[PDB]
Symmetry: C2
Subunit: 79 residues, 2 copies
Amino acid sequence: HHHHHSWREQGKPPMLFKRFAFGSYAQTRAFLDALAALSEETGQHPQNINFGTTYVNITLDAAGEAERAFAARVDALAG
Amino acid sequence: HHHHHHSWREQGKPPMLFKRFAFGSYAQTRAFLDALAALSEETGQHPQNINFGTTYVNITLDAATLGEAERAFAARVDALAGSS
Ligand code: NI
Ligand code: NI
């Protein structure tokens, strides 16, 4: 049990989707920088990232244990 | 090479400008994304949405309009992609 907003599983070949919210552009930008660093280190890239000034939508495609662990590393970065 | 000189597309009910940029590698896409963040901070102008993968970036600009401030932002984004 935790207090993070859940990742939603959807689509025929399943995907994990989550919308992260931030209080300002600077907080969104700082998170996107840490998310880029995470993908660069791991070689694991979400299938899609899209963002505005106060939100980041992330979609992870089925490679599973590894997808859930990457979603947990992203949740840890958000807070 | 990919082509970055195509026109921005005008689309949607309150008009928006839309363009997709494609790159040959993650390094090139990432350099463009980092330069786009610097541009937004320089201008204080932020796209409505930036939507990307490892080899492409889709940008949507909203009406402040649409006027010349939005078109000038679009042209500076083209110059970051190598088109001027
Ligand atoms: Ni052409
Ligand atoms: Ni050519």
